Protein: Na(+)/H(+) exchange regulatory cofactor NHE-RF1
Organism: Homo sapiens
Amino acid sequence: LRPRLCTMKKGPSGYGFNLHSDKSKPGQFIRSVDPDSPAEASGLRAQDRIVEVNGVCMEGKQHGDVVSAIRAGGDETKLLVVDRETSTTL
């Protein structure tokens, strides 16, 4: 599965997701997505990692800097996200 774009327009309750850091892995991940939210409708899923915000790479950025990038876009955001890697050599 490859990176997917989730495009959403903000409602009165925001987009409807929680963004958080991981214990082990770098990057900002989707903790949860609210039912019936703009976020859910856009295809965003729990455990997704944010790769880009509005076409800008988020690699190496701290949590607050990804949050600011999302907020800076005003009433809309476009998140390029990927699910967690599921490939292991044994």
Summary: The two ends are 21 Å apart (CA to CA). Residues 63-72 form the longest helix (10 residues). The longest strand covers residues 76-82. Strands lie at 4-9, 17-21, 28-33, 49-53, 56-57, 76-82.
